[PDB]
Design a protein around this nucleic acid. Structure first.
Ligand SMILES: [Zn+2]
Lengths: 66, 288, 1340, 251
DNA sequence: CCCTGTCTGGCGTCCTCTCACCTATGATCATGACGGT
DNA sequence: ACCGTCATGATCATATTATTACGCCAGACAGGG
């Protein structure tokens, strides 16, 4: 279901901007999880270009130049 | 309430009629002012499950996609195929309903001109590409989404479709509310699906399958009606037959589950002993 | 006959039903409750005496001392209301209490105390109520709002359907005490019976029945009947009453008297019961399988062994029968446990019980209350006697005992406040009866179960909580000191009492700030039945049913006036005629319809007495005697409307206005509006603003005079008489002699309230409306208030409206207004703002109020005096300096080095930062009142002494005018005395006023009268002198301030706003609208007479938003103005009074059987000219709510004027000058300006201040802030492909500080470019997550 | 920070940290004081509960409180909830160069332009006006320009009509549900104090004119002006994205 | 040992505007007014 | 009129109890056929 599916994501900021932050931050902390940003709300949190709209060319460029 | 409000607003409502009116309107204001919270929380859950999904390819390179048919509840055909397969790219190439013709090719967007050439040929159902069958890792390819919907063309490489989709489902959350036998209507041809049947002694084709779908196909090829016929019903008609508009074609009794047979012969009571297994209840008002 | 202000302008009145009970005093809830609270009340209850007699006498911890209670008394307040609002004090009264201390001796607490002491003691300050019904807490006039909560008593609810997911309903029985521990009996799906106390852990219910010292034999004696088995020679025979066998299938062939009655396999019919009870069958025969599961009642013991044969509440087997049969018992008592009739709920409950006696039950109850501690029999007895059975911790009120006896079908409604054994046993009996299928459950929203608290009861409860804290303190101190040496003011201290009552009146959830911008808004905020607050429900949790109008709100709580939004139906408003019962419920008047005749006696029914009887509807036709003219009449029996016969009715409603409130009974044609639009119309009629010259409603309901006079904005005459001196400041009434006291000679002075600030920044003015030499009657208006006119209620103004689409400028709901409206200055209102400048003492130095300001111009300071505080009456704009204040700062770390350096320069060089009080951004207006509050011991500057001399001369001149005009009336009485019995016609007025008091006269009542008037003269002289000295010592002395503030300068601006595109106007039916274009005069659609229409509405709002009442109001307003134009035509031609009398009489008859029936033949040729002087701007018409003016009466009144019958005039155009096709509707609608103006919402920000913890801009308008680019807007920009717009929308424009300074340099140099960086609030997120044990980083 | 007065309105975290440090100092002194076993067990237990109350208050039994009965807000309550950092300061932010006022009709407009008042226009475009004033040469330092627009002389309105001309703004109605609730217009200056909004566009915003309010936002940088003209312009949103139906239907 | 009531936690709409208001106390040196010489 | 006594206001650390009245809806837990 949609709230169990958005809280079970491979990106803990996406699952922490949404409902309960305690459960998700302890699960991510004891798992040692890492957030390869790669979505819209991680980049709205961290303050950069959205990887969808005009910023999709910027993220193509950055993903190409690694 | 069994006593209505016989006075309109140009005539005056008296006191009791206005008080019953206030019952009916206070319920509506409470429903909107509490409905809006669930509508907003639904939009939030939807844009946070979507949140990631970006059109990131141009073709996933597949041949799978869902089978768009017109939807029919049992009344007249509710939503036509041109509402469901408008601007969605076909999965395999649609055969023209005559015989084995390449009417449309296998990766064409179906805009209004293609949908009119679909409606002229009375095309049954289209196997079309759906987003849930997209093979793209981490995103949706540009063909399996479909038309842009506010642009005439296909979706561009990039445009966030998860967020516009989540907003478009959750945005009408305010307008939504919060709190015998089969009689045919039109005149056409009969077809049966999921059917295993047998002819009774009288002639009415009874069915030995519970899950039988009774379709009414017209003289053109498209499916215009559909119904669900239970296990053991008295069908007035048969397979492939032509009927008249309004003629009863089905009959059953839902309060009496039929234990009808396939063959004939004599009846024996196997493991039926009166006193422990079955009981003797002679009827009061009839005697049988 | 009519009162003299009702001969000024007599309102035309339609309406058919002759009234029998007039509208009561609309503020009776507040005033009657608080009069019930504070008054010397004998016989114990109610009031403060209930608290002082329930918490006292405080007796000590066995020290034989006791602090008992005598009486109480409130002294006068030190400050009256006006000085209290000006200065800022509470409006309180000191509560003196006479307490007594007694101290008993040793070995005899029934012996003599050695010493007593009775004395006066100070405790608390309770705030009094003003005559308007409001409190003044800290200079701001506040209202405590009535609460609607659950009635104390038993309550049998049914948890229907939802539990256990199998449809088996539960039943709980919540006992709701007024003060103490709750008690919930309930069931469970195993059909066991479970008690709980205050929502704690759950126990089986009969554990409390053992706690009341019941043995189990007595419990089964109570909760079941008995079945008798007699062992008489054959198969253990049975006593049988066949009523238990109603529908049971027997296991054998029941025969008796040698006759087969009942067959095996069949059930016992009712006629077989009749056979067995007709033949009087007693003993029948049972098999050995019949008592295989029968449950024994009491214990049987064997006499030989001394053991127990079978325990109580146990099923019987073969061996138990074999044991008790050979022990000598012939009688066997069992229980009847049926499927439908009587379940064994008590029996299964006792089988779940582990306890066996009183002690174990008390131990288990003591253990579920306080978990995990050693119980002791004394502690368990003390706890269970202090839960329910003590006068201290448990108290149903009289309301609670009434509901608890009524809902258990008792007789006496009087009982103790504590429970007993019979009470809990009757609760369990009624719960088992409801489970058995007979009797009904009780709904919650039924208004026989919703009590109304008010100001008096809630203040009593908060005062009682203060008293139980102070009895903790007094029990501490009384037995821990030396006696006798102390007095009962060293023990009791006034801090918790005053803290409790000051916290309740100061900040509660029900002591709220009065919405005061309108007389209507006052008088409908004081009448409010809020469901929220302490003890009630909350907005974001509940619910569905409580937000819905129950069928018993009819005539108690208004159905249509409630705030839409998050709390609909919780902020209910009380109706017009609805009183409050003795206990606290709601009651409403009715008319006792005896068998044929509607008797005109009123008779108050509550919410549960209404249900049993049958009530006729309000507007039922009756022919002059009371006989109902139909033979089917619409009535309502038990919450359900129907059609009943002519003479089975028992009550009729009083008047047809009683379902609605006073907010929504000033709406004309209410019966034509759909209820949503009537709701929005009543709410916006509450939200109006007072204009400059309020006019009148042409189409009212006649309810305006009750709302105006019964509020407190007009100056109602106390004693009637003759006016002597009218002025814009004061009004002097000379009291008539047939209304007048013998002593205290008496001519009254009304000091009006001129331009001062309301709470909503409006301008609460009072204008005198009487002439000079004019008679006034007792109970009559003298001075109109804000939004009043001649004692009526004029909220907005009435303007010429047309319904037509006009070139798109009224598209959705907009309004288009001619410039003729703004030229007439008719929507110009007066606001008063109160700007304040405090001057504190910092630790860098004190601040000054000097006029010298660093780095400003002399032209900016020319509006100041030599003292630095602005003159009275200088029109300022935004940015002008009102109070020149500079920060007295600096301080260069003291020391000798700097000590000798300060001598050279001298004083302060420039260590004064500029922090003056300035006008807010974008207003104007006039400085009308300046106050200077100064701490005593600080030098008062020049303008402070100037204001003190001004107020001192004003007070002395005003009190001298009081004494002078009062003694002018007194000497005018003295002259009237001396003429009778010893006249000096021409001799008296030559000899002086001193030698009138000592002139001789005959010893009669006249000489005694002279002695009375003389001593009243001398007493008023001495009283004048002492109160002048008291007023001077109140003015000249210092003022209390906050700790560490030197002086406060307050400046009152009076802004005078106007109209503009963007304001919100609305009618009285829900037709809102932003006024969209202020057209010139010429563009308006005019008609074939010449007059332009003022406002062009939009027709398309009528068929969807179904408020058809505004079009009938428009047509009747045009009829009213047609009569007014014909009066203006018959008066402008200077016609004699005969033709005016003819036409006014024809315009006042005009209808069906109506109530008005005036005649002008008793107005005598001078009042008719003045009545026509008041009717020439239109004729006011009353239209009561549900008994209004029908269509044919509007047509007949439009025929009296020469207007067209259909109401529609053909209208030309202003632009083209050619006719609009299909003639349009014009008329007058009474439209209101709302105070949602557009130069209070408009705001803009380039770059302002930034917040401190997260470097983002501030929020609001007063703080110069930026609009919240919220979360859904971020989603809407993700939904496009706008990526750079969102990046600068949440990095550059908002948060990143180096990013935004780079941005500002780049914008002022022309280079549109952003250097992005990181949000600083994300670094705040890193520090808050990192401040836990979590290690968040940034890789690479 | 102190509020208006002479006292400091202290935060809740300072109460939490100050209690943990008070208890930790007491426990060091006791462990120093060689107290018996009970002392140290209650002391360490009070420290455990103090730390557990600092981190996530109220997850243990009934939460501690300072004033008056309301519990005080801890670190986890600075993160979680509707008013934490995610939902209140990182997903939604307060925003400079933004404005808000009551809307009204103005039917003379073309559907790519909206009316915008002169007072709001001179406040939202202060840096562009400063840059324009410094380009002409009328003034010298920045102060002079801020005095000029604080006085509002006769020459800054031509400057304002030359910074408006081709510069779109984002109008936004306050409950934005779908993407058609943020649309970009070109301003046309209004004598008045109310945003004039083209009527057809109202059916997209669900905006009637019964007292509604809208916010204006200014695209500062150049890529944002181009995104407002090329993606978010009101001429570009004539079909609703939920279907194929036109959203500029005449109402 | 697989169903099962029962208990515990965790959600519950966005944007805006106006107003008022944040424990009690228990103990003592030193200032301040009152009375005798 | 000066000297001595009762009274009354500053600064200052001390550290937590006798109310209940949402409505689902998952998720974990002891109980028992
Ligand atoms: Zn695909």
């Amino acid at each position: 279901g949609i709230t169990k599916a958005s809280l079970a994501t491979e990106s803990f900021i996406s699952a922490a901007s949404f409902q309960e932050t305690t459960r998700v931050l302890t699960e991510a902390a004891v798992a040692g999880k890492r957030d390869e940003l790669r979505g819209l709300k991680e980049n709205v949190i961290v303050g950069r270009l959205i990887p969808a709209g005009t910023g999709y060319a910027y993220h193509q460029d950055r993903m190409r130049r690694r | 309430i069994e006593t209505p409000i016989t006075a309109n607003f140009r005539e005056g409502l008296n006191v009791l009629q206005y008080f019953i009116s206030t019952h009916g309107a206070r319920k509506g204001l409470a429903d909107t002012a509490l409905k809006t919270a669930n509508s907003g929380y639904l939009t939030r859950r939807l844009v946070d499950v979507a949140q990631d999904l970006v059109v990131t390819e141009d073709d996933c390179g597949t041949h799978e996609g869902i089978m768009m048919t017109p939807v029919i509840e049992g009344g007249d055909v509710k939503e036509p195929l041109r509402d469901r397969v408008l601007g969605r790219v076909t999965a395999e190439d649609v055969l023209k309903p005559g015989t084995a013709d390449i009417l449309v090719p296998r990766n064409t967007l179906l805009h209004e001109q293609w949908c009119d050439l679909l409606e002229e040929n009375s095309v049954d159902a289209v196997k079309v590409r759906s987003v849930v069958s997209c093979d793209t890792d981490f995103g949706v390819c540009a063909h399996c989404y479909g038309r842009d919907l506010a642009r005439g063309h296909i979706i561009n490489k990039g445009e966030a479709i998860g967020v516009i989709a989540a907003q478009s489902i959750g945005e009408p959350g305010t307008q939504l509310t919060m709190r015998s036998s089969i009689q045919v209507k039109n005149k056409g041809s009969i077809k049966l699906s999921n059917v295993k049947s047998v002819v009774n002694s009288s002639g009415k084709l009874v069915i030995t399958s519970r899950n039988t779908e009774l379709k009414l196909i017209d003289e053109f090829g498209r499916t215009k009606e559909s119904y669900k016929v239970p296990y053991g019903a008295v069908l007035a008609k048969g397979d492939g037959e032509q009927v008249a508009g309004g003629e009863t074609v089905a009959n059953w009794d839902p309060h009496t589950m039929p234990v009808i047979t396939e063959v004939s012969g004599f009846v024996r009571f196997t493991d039926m002993i009166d006193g422990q297994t079955i009981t003797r209840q002679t009827d009061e008002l009839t005697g049988l | 006959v009519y009162s003299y202000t009702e001969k000024k302008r007599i309102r035309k009145d339609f309406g058919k039903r002759p009234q029998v009970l007039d509208v009561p005093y609309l503020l009776s809830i507040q005033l009657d409750s608080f009069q019930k609270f504070i008054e010397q009340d004998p016989e114990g209850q109610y009031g403060l005496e209930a608290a002082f007699r329930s918490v006292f006498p405080i007796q000590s911890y066995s020290g034989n001392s006791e602090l008992q209670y005598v009486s109480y008394r409130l002294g006068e307040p030190v400050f009256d209301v006006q000085e209290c609002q000006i200065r800022g004090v509470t409006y309180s009264a000191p509560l003196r209490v006479k307490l007594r201390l007694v101290i008993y001796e040793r070995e005899a607490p029934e012996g003599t105390v050695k010493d007593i002491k009775e004395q006066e003691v100070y405790m608390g300050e309770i705030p009094l109520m003003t005559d308007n019904g409001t409190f003044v807490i800290n200079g701001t006039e506040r209202v405590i709002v009535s609460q609607l909560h659950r009635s104390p008593g038993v309550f049998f609810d049914s948890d229907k359907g939802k539990t256990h997911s199998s449809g088996k309903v539960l039943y709980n029985a919540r006992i709701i005490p007024y003060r103490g521990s709750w008690l919930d009996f309930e069931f469970d799906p195993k059909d066991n019976l479970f008690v709980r106390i205050d929502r704690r852990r759950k126990l089986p219910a009969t554990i409390i029945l053992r706690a009341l010292n019941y043995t189990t034999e007595q419990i089964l004696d109570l909760f079941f009947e008995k079945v008798i088995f007699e062992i008489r020679d054959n198969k253990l025979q049975m006593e049988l009453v066949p009523e238990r066998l109603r529908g049971e299938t027997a296991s054998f062939d029941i025969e008796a008297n040698g006759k087969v009655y009942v067959e095996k396999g069949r059930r016992i019919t009712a006629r077989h019961i009749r056979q067995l009870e007709k033949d009087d069958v007693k003993l029948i025969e049972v098999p050995v399988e019949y008592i295989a599961g029968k449950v024994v009642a009491k214990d049987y013991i064997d006499e030989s062994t001394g053991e127990l044969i079978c325990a109580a509440n146990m099923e019987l087997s073969l061996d138990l029968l074999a044991k008790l049969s050979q022990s000598g018992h012939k009688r066997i008592e069992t229980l009847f446990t049926n499927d439908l009739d009587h379940g064994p709920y008590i029996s299964e409950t006792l089988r779940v019980d582990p306890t066996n006696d009183r002690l174990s039950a008390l131990v288990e109850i003591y253990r579920m209350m306080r978990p995990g501690e050693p119980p002791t029999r004394e502690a368990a007895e003390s706890l269970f006697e202090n839960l329910f059975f003590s006068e201290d911790r448990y108290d149903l009120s009289a309301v609670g005992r009434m509901k608890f006896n009524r809902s258990l079908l008792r007789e006496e409604i009087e009982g103790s406040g504590i429970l007993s054994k019979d009470d809990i046993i009757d609760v369990m009996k009624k719960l088992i009866d409801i489970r058995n299928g007979k009797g009904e459950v009780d709904d919650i929203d039924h208004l026989g179960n919703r009590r109304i608290r008010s100001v008096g009861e809630m203040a009593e409860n908060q005062f009682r909580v203060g008293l139980v804290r102070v009895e903790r303190a007094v029990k501490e101190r009384l037995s821990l000191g030396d006696l006798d040496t102390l007095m009962p003011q060293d023990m009791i201290n006034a801090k918790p009492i005053s803290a409790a009552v000051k916290e309740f009146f100061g900040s509660s959830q029900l002591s709220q700030f009065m919405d005061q911008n309108n007389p209507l808004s006052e008088i409908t905020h004081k009448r409010r039945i809020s469901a929220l607050g302490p003890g009630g429900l909350t907005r974001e949790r509940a619910g569905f049913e409580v937000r819905d109008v129950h069928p018993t709100h009819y005539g108690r709580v208004c159905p249509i006036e409630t705030p839409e939004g998050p709390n609909i139906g919780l902020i209910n408003s009380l109706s017009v005629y609805a009183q409050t019962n003795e206990y606290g419920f709601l009651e409403t008047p009715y008319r006792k319809v005896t068998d044929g005749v509607v008797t005109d006696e009123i008779h108050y029914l509550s919410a549960i007495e209404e249900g049993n009887y049958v009530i006729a509807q309000a507007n039922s036709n009756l022919d002059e005697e009371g006989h109902f003219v139909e033979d089917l009449v619409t009535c309502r029996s038990k919450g359900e409307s129907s059609l009943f016969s002519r003479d089975q009715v028992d009550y009729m409603d009083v008047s047809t206005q009683q379902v609605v409130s006073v907010g929504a009974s000033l709406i004309p044609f209410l019966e034509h509006d759909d209820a949503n639009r009537a709701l929005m119309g009543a709410n916006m009629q509450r939200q109006a603003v007072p204009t400059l010259r309020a006019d009148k409603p042409l189409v009212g309901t006649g309810m305006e005079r009750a709302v105006a006079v019964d509020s407190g904005v007009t100056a109602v005459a106390k004693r009637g008489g003759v006016v002597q001196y009218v002025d814009a400041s004061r009004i002097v009434i000379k009291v008539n002699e047939d209304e007048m006291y013998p002593g205290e000679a008496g001519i009254d002075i009304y000091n009006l309230t001129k331009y001062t600030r309301s709470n909503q920044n409006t301008c609460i003015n009072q204008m005198p409306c009487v002439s000079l030499g004019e008679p006034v009657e007792r109970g009559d208006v003298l001075a109109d208030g804000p939004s009043t006119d001649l004692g009526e209620l004029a909220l907005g103004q009435n303007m010429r409206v047309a319904f037509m689409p006009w070139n798109g400028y009224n598209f959705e709901d907009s309004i288009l207004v001619s410039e003729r409206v703004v030229q007439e200055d008719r929507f110009t209102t007066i606001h008063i703002q109160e700007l304040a400048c405090v001057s504190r003492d910092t630790k860098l130095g004190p601040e000054e109020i000097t006029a010298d300001i660093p780095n400003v111009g002399e032209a900016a300071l020319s509006k100041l005096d030599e003292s630095g505080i602005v003159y009275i009456g200088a029109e300022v704009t935004g940015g002008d300096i009102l109070v020149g204040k500079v920060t007295p700062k600096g301080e260069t770390q003291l020391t000798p080095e700097e000590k000798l350096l300060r001598a050279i320069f001298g004083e302060k060089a420039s260590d004064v930062k500029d922090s003056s009080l300035r006008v807010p951004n974008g207003v104007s207006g006039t400085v009308i009142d300046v106050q200077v509050f100064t701490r005593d011991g600080v030098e008062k500057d020049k303008r402070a002494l100037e204001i003190e001399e001004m107020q001192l001369k004003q007070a002395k001149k005003d009190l001298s005018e009081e004494l002078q005009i009062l003694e002018a009336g007194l000497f005018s009485r003295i002259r009237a005395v001396l003429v009778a019995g010893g006249v000096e016609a021409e001799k008296l007025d030559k000899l002086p006023r001193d030698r009138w008091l000592e002139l001789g006269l005959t010893d009669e009542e006249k000489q005694n009268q002279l002695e009375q008037l003389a001593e009243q003269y001398d007493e008023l002289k001495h009283e004048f002198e002492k109160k002048l000295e008291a007023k001077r010592r109140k003015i000249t002395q210092g003022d209390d301030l906050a700790p560490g503030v030197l002086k406060i300068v307050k400046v009152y601006l009076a802004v005078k706003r106007r109209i503009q595109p963007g304001d919100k106007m609305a009618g009285r039916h829900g037709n809102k609208g932003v006024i969209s274009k202020i057209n010139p005069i010429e563009d308006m659609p005019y008609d074939e007479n010449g007059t332009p229409v003022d406002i062009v509405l939009n027709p398309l709002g009528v068929p969807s938003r179904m408020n058809i009442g505004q079009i009938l109001e428009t047509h009747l307003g045009m009829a009213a103005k047609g009569i007014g134009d014909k009066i203006n035509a018959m008066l402008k031609q200077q016609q004699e009074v005969a033709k005016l009398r003819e036409f006014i009489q024809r315009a006042y008859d005009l209808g069906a059987d109506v109530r008005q029936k005036v005649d002008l033949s008793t107005f005598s040729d001078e009042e008719v000219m003045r009545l026509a002087e008041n009717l020439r701007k239109g004729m006011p018409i009353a239209t009561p709510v549900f008994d209004g003016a029908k269509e044919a009466e509007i047509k007949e009144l439009l025929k009296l004027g020469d207007l067209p019958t259909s109401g529609q005039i053909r209208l030309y155009d202003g632009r083209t000058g050619e006719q609009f096709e299909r003639p349009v509707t014009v008329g007058y609608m009474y439209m209101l300006k709302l105070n949602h103006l557009v130069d209070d919402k408009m705001h803009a920000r380039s770059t302002g201040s930034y917040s401190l913890v997260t470097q983002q801009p501030l929020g609001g308008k007063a703080q110069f802030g930026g609009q919240r680019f919220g979360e859904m807007e971020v989603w809407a920009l993700e939904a496009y492909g706008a990526a750079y717009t969102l990046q600068e929308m949440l990095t550059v424009k908002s948060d990143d500080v180096n990013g935004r300074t780079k941005m500002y340099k780049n914008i002022v140099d022309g280079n549109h470019q952003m250097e992005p960086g990181m949000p600083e609030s994300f670094n705040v997120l890193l520090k808050e997550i990192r401040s836990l044990g979590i290690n968040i980083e940034l890789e690479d | 920070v102190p509020l208006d007065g002479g006292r400091f309105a202290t935060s809740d975290l300072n109460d939490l940290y100050r209690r943990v440090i008070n208890r930790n100092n007491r426990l060091k002194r006791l462990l120093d004081l060689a107290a018996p076993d009970i002392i140290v067990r209650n002391e360490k237990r009070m420290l455990q509960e103090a730390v557990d109350a600092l981190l996530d208050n109220g997850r243990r039994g009934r939460a501690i409180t300072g004033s008056n009965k309301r519990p005080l807000k801890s670190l986890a309550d600075m993160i979680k909830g509707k008013q934490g950092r995610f939902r209140q300061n990182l997903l939604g932010k307060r925003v400079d160069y933004s404005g808000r006022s009551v809307i009204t009709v103005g039917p003379y407009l073309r559907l790519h332009q909206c009316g915008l008042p002169k007072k709001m226009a001179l406040e939202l475009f202060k840096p562009f006006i400063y840059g324009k004033l410094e380009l002409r040469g009328l003034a010298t330092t920045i102060k002079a320009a801020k005095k000029m627009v604080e006085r509002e002389e006769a020459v800054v309105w031509d400057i304002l009509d030359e910074v408006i001309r081709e510069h779109p703004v984002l109008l936004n109605r306050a409950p934005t549900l779908h993407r058609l609730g943020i649309q970009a217009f070109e301003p046309v200056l209004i004598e008045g104090k109310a945003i004039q909004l083209h009527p057809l566009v109202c059916a997209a915003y669900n905006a009637d004119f019964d007292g509604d309010q809208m916010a204006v936002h200014v695209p500062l940088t150049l890529e944002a002006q181009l995104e407002a003209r090329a993606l978010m312009m009101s001429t570009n949103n004539i079909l609703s994205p939920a279907n194929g139906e036109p959203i500029i239907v005449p109402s």
